[PDB]
């Protein structure tokens, strides 16, 4: 009955991700006591770990690898308004692959940050993953973020407010440059080990009056980490976004005219709009829309609809073109885009200049790997090398890409269905990525149909 | 209209890609200018047949590694269904995709070549046609259409005698496998020329039609397209017997013993007399609750708690399966045959390997008692009967025997209780689906005061 919410837990190594997640699983009662003792005993019989709470996240990472998920109810807990599943975490081989491919899709990210002397400054430095994980979460469109300032018991003095305020000020400034509004992000001081302020206020922090978030969708306030999880906003239906309609096919139909066919990915398409076709840059009014050969009054996201457009021939638009309205951020041609990729099994060496085909939404266009900007570690997202010379299997990377033919692609944080792509080479998928930013082409006003000229004159 | 998923199987080079592509051509699923763009791309790569075949060759290639970008090219429309091709043999991840259920076919189109040229006309005892049909039966694809292809190349052309020979030979095999041959339409086609795919072929006036006789009702037709419109919807989980794997068991004061779990099939009603397997306990359900609020019915998909009478918390655990005591009650598995694919891991697997099995909410070590067949994961063909070992990348038929009492189900009867993962320490070393289960010779045990 309650809505389902997926959580990913991020943060620098040894910041307390495992301890905090497992303690949350213990305290929220999704696992009975006998089952916990069975799994604590099994972890000890493996020799490894035997820390408290540790087996929970180590078991999750191991079961998020190649293969299936058989049951995930061990990492699902219930709050007052949400079923919440811990879907993934960094520190295992297929982490970045799951994030990029979207097999692990998160509605919110819990960023753990350690508060001990040295621990915080290490994760927030250039060598640390706090900023890298935050940027990765933003790159994937996880635009809800909870920051748990962990290990408050180990500050000097213990449970230090001065320390907590310092961490909030510096993390806020960094996530602000990344793209987050730090006024929407709750900062919860906690102790994953002892449990302080996870399910209820901690007697050890009477100075903490609570966190607050401001947002157009309604302000919220609370004290515990669990309260912060209840302020997660549901999956934003893309009806609010501008129109994006990648064309699947374009038919000519006797009597009617030209009718492209596609799934509406963002926004609404209703008859009478003055749409713009990228990357060809044509602009027309749509005469009608039809779904399942019956006419529709408006086409919300998800519908496979064909639509009748005026004065445009079939040789003028193709499968792979993107359709959006000219009233609300019309799609432009992509001049180049940077993206984050994961290199899949492929014995060869990818160098700069490697030109493969790029399946992106309904488009299918050869691109050039112009630069290899960064070499990323796939187990954690950690940056390994600036401007690498080549990439091999199992590597992740940031690359700039220039298409060899006109192409319309979007940033994945903005329009997800147009920002995830596959890299194919003959009958082999060699890489998959998500688009970081796309520098749009100069262009200008495209050729406007007689029908579109009449609409924009009343 | 209903959405329907199709898997296309058959021996290599029997004409799966040509038949499928020609069907997608003739059903207007793709515009003509896009068809030409991809036919020219296909000829440049030079790895597959230049016309028609690129459609299924593209699909095979894009069902790889775990990334799906767009499937619009493989969804065509018949008069009763939106049909989608999801997979076909001939790529590394075929068997893995079938088992892991990232491809869930409603019906299997089996393609058999009638024109065998100077090769072996016989459908061999250990051949790909039989092994593919055995695979579809293991994965619960209980609807099967046989396209007898390349009728243009028989001796003589469009030979009724050759067509009969093949139906007789194939019917015997699929009847042994477990299909009722009376329910399988046999359509003589030419995927290349388009004979008998959407309309009757003038080259086969002897073919008066195929006939199916099912428990639901008979149907007849001529073309392969009409065969696709006799596919039935799957059995909704609501109409199957109750199956409820227990996630947790709690002791609530006053209330008593409250198991919690997800209804996978059937309906859970307060007042039902359920049986817990494999502990063989039968008792009445006093109430059913969802979100600390009562419930008339617990439907498939609901995560519920239910209070049972006269049952101790020491008596039922996570991993036990709950079901109706009257309609198909669950029982303890004495042993079960399964189909697995081995993932990378150190060393080889012999008979006697006793790893942990992850099935529904259970977590129990099982013995690989017999390794029965070694299967290639690309083509799905049989490499070896009774192999001495399995290595990474292999696919196999194995007979498993649980070490502690376990309750599992055939994947075709109860899918959520029929697929499993195999773990060694923390590594995932195999995934599989259950063919058939030998239930324990144990009769009704503890029946409480209700
Ligand atoms: N004092 C203290 N130690 C903690 C706390 N949370 C975790 N630790 C410890 O810090 C280390 C970090 O371990 P872990 O939770 O596995 O970190 P991960 O690498 O981010 O998953 C372990 O030794 C934990 O026991 C905390 O709140 N307070
Ligand atoms: N003569 C004839 N050749 C066919 C027919 N269908 C397919 N072929 C050819 O048989 C070969 C194998 O077909 P393909 O579709 O690639 O087979 P698959 O390996 O099962 O996908 C190709 O050369 C096709 O052109 C048919 O009906 N008649
Ligand atoms: N990817 C090209 C490497 O050189 P860089 O300077 O970083 O890229 C800009 C191009 O040189 C433009 O001419
Ligand atoms: N408990 C019945 C209320 O739900 P409903 O949808 O009506 O289920 C009825 C059966 O599924 C009908 O077969
Ligand atoms: N799996 C080897 C054990 O001996 P085997 O003869 O193959 O199996 C015995 C049957 O299960 C009972 O007849």
**Going by CA atoms, what residue is nearest to atom 1 of ligand 4?**
B297
From CA A62, how far away is CA B425, in angstroms rounded? 10
Q: Do B34 and A319 touch (CB under 8 A)?
A: yes
**Nearest alpha-carbon partner for A146 in A294, A286, A305, A7:** A7
**What is the DSSP-derived secondary structure letter of residue B313?**
G
Q: Quick one: resolution in A?
A: 2.7
Q: Is A27 helix (H, G, I), strand (E, B) or coil?
A: helix
Written as six digits, the tokens of A341 are 């990729």
Q: Establish whether the linkage from the previous residue to A77 is cis, with ω within 30° of 0.
A: no
- At which of A235, A265, A292 does a domain end? A235
Q: Is A434 helix (H, G, I), strand (E, B) or coil?
A: strand
Q: Do B67 and A101 touch (CB under 8 A)?
A: yes
- Which of B27, B31, B97, B103 would best serve as a mutation to test chain A binding (most A beta carbons within 10 A)? B31
Q: Establish whether the linkage from the previous residue to B179 is cis, with ω within 30° of 0.
A: no
CA torsion B182-B183-B184-B186 (nearest 10°) is 60
Beta strand A282-291 with A447-448 is parallel
A94 and A229 part of one domain: yes
Q: If contacts are CB pairs under 8 Å, which of residues 142-171 in chain B contact chain A?
A: none
From CA A432, how far away is CA A436, in angstroms rounded? 13
- Does residue A144 lie in a domain region? yes
**What is the DSSP-derived secondary structure letter of residue A320?**
T
Q: Establish whether the linkage from the previous residue to B278 is cis, with ω within 30° of 0.
A: yes
Q: What is the 3-state secondary structure (H, E, C) of A213-263?
A: ECCCCCCEEECCHHHHHHCCCCCCCHHHCCCEEEEEEEEEECCCEEEEEEE
From CA A23, how far away is CA A9, in angstroms rounded? 13
From CA B113, how far away is CA B317, in angstroms rounded? 52
Cα B263 to averaged position of ligand 4 atoms, centre (Å):
14
Q: Where are the beta strands (DSSP E) in A239-345?
A: 245-253, 257-263, 274-278, 282-291, 294-295, 304-309, 322-325, 334-343
Q: Taking a C-beta distance cutoff of 8 angstroms, is the pair A195, A203 a contact? A: no
CB atoms closer than 10 angstroms to residue A224: 19
From CA B102, how far away is CA B366, in angstroms rounded? 25
Q: How many residues does chain B have?
A: 450
- Which of A249, A306, A420 would best serve as a mutation to test chain B binding (most B beta carbons within 10 A)? A249
Chain A residues lying within 8 Å of B37, measured CB to CB: 319
Distances, alpha carbon A446 to alpha carbons A323, A330, B5, in Å: 13, 11, 42
Q: Do A361 and B100 touch (CB under 8 A)?
A: no
Q: By what technique were these coordinates determined?
A: X-ray
Name the H helices within B114-230: 128-138, 160-177, 224-228
A96 and A220 part of one domain: yes
Written as six digits, the tokens of B28 are 């207007």
CA distance B249 to chain A (A): 7
Q: Taking a C-beta distance cutoff of 8 angstroms, is the pair B98, B135 a contact? A: yes
* Ligand nearest the Cα atom of residue A335: 3
From CA B58, how far away is CA B53, in angstroms rounded? 9
Cα B189 to averaged position of ligand 2 atoms, centre (Å):
12
Q: Taking a C-beta distance cutoff of 8 angstroms, is the pair B230, B220 a contact? A: no
Q: Establish whether the linkage from the previous residue to B156 is cis, with ω within 30° of 0.
A: yes
From CA A18, how far away is CA A193, in angstroms rounded? 10
- Buried/exposed A82-102: b ≥16 CB within 10 Å, e otherwise: bbbbbbbbbebebbbbbbbbb
Cα A400 to averaged position of ligand 3 atoms, centre (Å):
10
- For the annotated binding site of A, the residues are 14-19, 150-151, 153, 191-193
Q: If contacts are CB pairs under 8 Å, which of residues 11-30 in chain A contact chain B?
A: 30
Chain A residues lying within 8 Å of B359, measured CB to CB: 70
- At which of A235, A262, A281 does a domain end? A235
Cβ-count burial of A214 within 10 angstroms (0-12 exposed, 13-18 middle, 19+ buried)? Answer: exposed
From CA B31, how far away is CA A406, in angstroms rounded? 20
The response to whether residue B370 sits with its C-beta less than 6 Å from ligand 5 reads yes
CA distance B447 to chain A (A): 25
A230 and A254 part of one domain: no
Domain count across chain A? 3
From CA A283, how far away is CA A161, in angstroms rounded? 58
CB atoms closer than 10 angstroms to residue A254: 5
B266 and B412 part of one domain: no
- Does residue B446 lie in a domain region? no
The response to whether residue B5 sits with its C-beta less than 6 Å from ligand 2 reads no
**Nearest alpha-carbon partner for B28 in A313, A361, A252, A296:** A252
- Does residue B449 lie in a domain region? no
B215 and B299 part of one domain: no
From CA B111, how far away is CA B9, in angstroms rounded? 6
Selecting from A292, A361, A424 the residue whose C-beta is nearest the C-beta of B70 gives A361
Cα B272 to averaged position of ligand 4 atoms, centre (Å):
16
Beta strand A350-351 with A357-360 is unpaired
A143 and A82 part of one domain: yes
- At which of B228, B263, B292 does a domain end? B228
Q: Do B67 and A250 touch (CB under 8 A)?
A: no
**Nearest alpha-carbon partner for A341 in A266, A419, A240:** A419
From CA A44, how far away is CA A38, in angstroms rounded? 10
From CA A394, how far away is CA A378, in angstroms rounded? 7
**Nearest alpha-carbon partner for A337 in A441, A265, A242:** A441
Supply the range of the domain harboring residue B396: 333-439
Q: Do B69 and A359 touch (CB under 8 A)?
A: yes
Selecting from A31, A314, A427 the residue whose C-beta is nearest the C-beta of B47 gives A427
From CA B331, how far away is CA B333, in angstroms rounded? 6
**Going by CA atoms, what residue is nearest to atom 3 of ligand 4?**
B297
Selecting from B61, B67, B101 the residue whose C-beta is nearest the C-beta of A427 gives B61
Residues in contact with ligand 4 by the CB-under-6-Å rule are B 238, 296-297, 299
CATH number of residue B371's parent domain: 2.40.30.10
- Please tell me the number of Cα atoms within 13 Å of B450 on its side-chain side: 13
Q: Taking a C-beta distance cutoff of 8 angstroms, is the pair A286, A327 a contact? A: no
A27 and A145 part of one domain: yes
Selecting from B45, B249, B291 the residue whose C-beta is nearest the C-beta of A426 gives B45
Best residue among B18, B116, B204 to mutate for probing ligand 2, ranked by most atoms within 8 Å of CB? B18
B389 and B266 part of one domain: no
Q: Is A63 helix (H, G, I), strand (E, B) or coil?
A: helix
From CA B170, how far away is CA A25, in angstroms rounded? 54
* Euclidean distance between the first and the last CA atom of chain B, given in angstroms as a whole number: 46
Q: If contacts are CB pairs under 8 Å, which of residues 83-112 in chain A contact chain B?
A: 97, 101, 103
Residue of B nearest to A252 (CA): B31
**Nearest alpha-carbon partner for A451 in A306, A282, A279, A244:** A282
A179 and A73 part of one domain: yes
Supply the angle between the helices A54-63 and A33-45 in degrees, to the nearest 10: 80
From CA B395, how far away is CA B96, in angstroms rounded? 9
Residue of A nearest to B289 (CA): A1
**What is the DSSP-derived secondary structure letter of residue B343?**
P
Name the H helices within B63-153: 94-100, 128-138
Q: Establish whether the linkage from the previous residue to A295 is cis, with ω within 30° of 0.
A: no
Supply the angle between the helices A17-27 and A54-63 in degrees, to the nearest 10: 100
Chain A residues lying within 8 Å of B423, measured CB to CB: 62
CATH number of residue B147's parent domain: 3.40.50.300
Q: Is A155 helix (H, G, I), strand (E, B) or coil?
A: coil
A357 and A313 part of one domain: no
- Buried/exposed B30-45: b ≥16 CB within 10 Å, e otherwise: bbeebbebbbeebeee
A93 and A209 part of one domain: yes
Beta strand B362-375 with B382-385 is antiparallel
Chain B residues lying within 8 Å of A263, measured CB to CB: 72
- Does residue B258 lie in a domain region? yes
Beta strand A108-114 with A396-403 is unpaired
Q: How far is CA A40 from the centre of its chain?
A: 33
From CA B16, how far away is CA B26, in angstroms rounded? 16
Best residue among B336, B368, B370, B438 to mutate for probing ligand 5, ranked by most atoms within 8 Å of CB? B370
Beta strand B81-87 with B2-10 is parallel
Q: Where are the beta strands (DSSP E) in B253-347?
A: 256-262, 273-277, 281-289, 303-308, 321-324, 333-342
Place of tokens 């009718």: A259
- Does residue B263 lie in a domain region? yes
Q: Taking a C-beta distance cutoff of 8 angstroms, is the pair B178, B134 a contact? A: no
Q: How many residues does chain A have?
A: 458
DSSP states along A382-423:
-EEEES-SEE-TT-EEEEEEEESS------TTT-GGGTEEEE
- Does residue B448 lie in a domain region? no
Q: If contacts are CB pairs under 8 Å, which of residues 341-400 in chain B contact chain A?
A: 343, 358-361, 363
* Euclidean distance between the first and the last CA atom of chain A, given in angstroms as a whole number: 48
From CA B241, how far away is CA B200, in angstroms rounded? 42
From CA B303, how far away is CA B300, in angstroms rounded? 9
Q: If contacts are CB pairs under 8 Å, which of residues 266-295 in chain B contact chain A?
A: 290-291
- Does residue B447 lie in a domain region? no
From CA B274, how far away is CA B281, in angstroms rounded? 8
From CA A16, how far away is CA A34, in angstroms rounded? 25
Written as six digits, the tokens of B293 are 């609020």
Residue of B nearest to A72 (CA): B361
A60 and A18 part of one domain: yes
Chain B residues lying within 8 Å of A101, measured CB to CB: 66-67
- Does residue A216 lie in a domain region? yes
Selecting from A70, A250, A361 the residue whose C-beta is nearest the C-beta of B31 gives A250
* Ligand nearest the Cα atom of residue A371: 3
Chain A residues lying within 8 Å of B249, measured CB to CB: 32, 34
Q: If contacts are CB pairs under 8 Å, which of residues 193-232 in chain A contact chain B?
A: none
What strands lie across the sheet with B107-113, from one edge to the other? B75-77, B81-87, B2-10, B107-113, B144-149, B186-188
**Nearest alpha-carbon partner for A234 in A82, A442, A13:** A82
């Amino acid at each position: 009955e309650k809505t389902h919410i997926n959580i990913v837990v991020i943060g620098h190594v040894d910041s307390g991700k495992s301890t905090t997640t497992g303690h949350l699983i213990y305290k929220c009662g999704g696992i009975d006591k006998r089952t916990i003792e069975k799994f604590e005993k099994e972890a000890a019989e493996m020799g490894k770990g035997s820390f408290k709470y540790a087996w929970v996240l180590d078991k999750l990472k191991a079961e998020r690898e190649r293969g299936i998920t058989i049951d995930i109810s061990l990492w699902k807990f219930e709050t007052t308004k949400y079923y919440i599943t811990i879907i993934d975490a960094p520190g295992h081989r297929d982490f970045i692959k799951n994030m990029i491919t979207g097999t692990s899709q998160a509605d919110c990210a819990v960023l753990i940050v350690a508060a001990g002397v040295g621990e915080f400054e290490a994760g927030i430095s250039k060598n640390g993953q706090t900023r890298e994980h935050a940027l990765l979460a933003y790159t994937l469109g996880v635009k809800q973020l909870i920051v748990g300032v962990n290990k408050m018991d180990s500050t000097e003095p213990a449970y230090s407010e001065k320390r907590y305020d310092e961490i909030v000020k510096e993390v806020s400034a960094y996530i602000k440059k990344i793209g987050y509004n730090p006024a929407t992000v709750p900062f919860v001081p906690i102790s994953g080990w002892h449990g302080d302020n996870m399910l209820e206020p901690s007697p050890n922090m009477p100075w903490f009056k609570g966190w607050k978030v401001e947002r157009k969708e309604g302000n919220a306030s609370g004290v515990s980490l669990l309260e912060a999880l209840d302020t997660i906003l549901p999956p934003t239906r893309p009806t609010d976004k501008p129109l994006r309609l990648p064309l699947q096919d374009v038919y000519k139909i006797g009597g009617i005219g030209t009718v492209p066919v596609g799934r509406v990915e963002t926004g609404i398409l209703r008859p009478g709009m003055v749409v713009t076709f990228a990357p060809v840059n044509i602009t027309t009014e749509v005469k009608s829309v039809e779904m399942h050969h019956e006419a529709l009054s408006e086409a919300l996201p998800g519908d496979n609809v064909g639509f009748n457009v005026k004065n445009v021939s079939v040789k003028d638009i193709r499968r792979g073109n993107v359709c959006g309205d000219s009233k609300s951020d019309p799609p432009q041609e992509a001049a180049q885009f940077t993206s984050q990729v994961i290199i899949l099994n492929h014995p060869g060496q990818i160098s700069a200049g490697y030109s493969p085909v790029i399946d992106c939404h309904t488009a299918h266009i050869a691109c050039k790997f112009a630069e290899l900007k960064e070499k990323i570690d796939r187990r954690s997202g950690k940056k390994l090398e600036d401007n690498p010379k080549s990439l091999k299997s199992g590597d992740a990377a940031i690359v700039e890409m220039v298409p060899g033919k006109p192409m319309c692609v979007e940033s994945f944080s903005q329009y997800p269905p147009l920002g995830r792509f596959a890299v194919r080479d003959m009958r082999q998928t060699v890489a998959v990525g998500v688009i970081k930013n796309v520098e749009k082409k100069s262009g200008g006003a495209g050729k406007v149909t007689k029908s579109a000229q009449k609409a924009q004159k009343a």
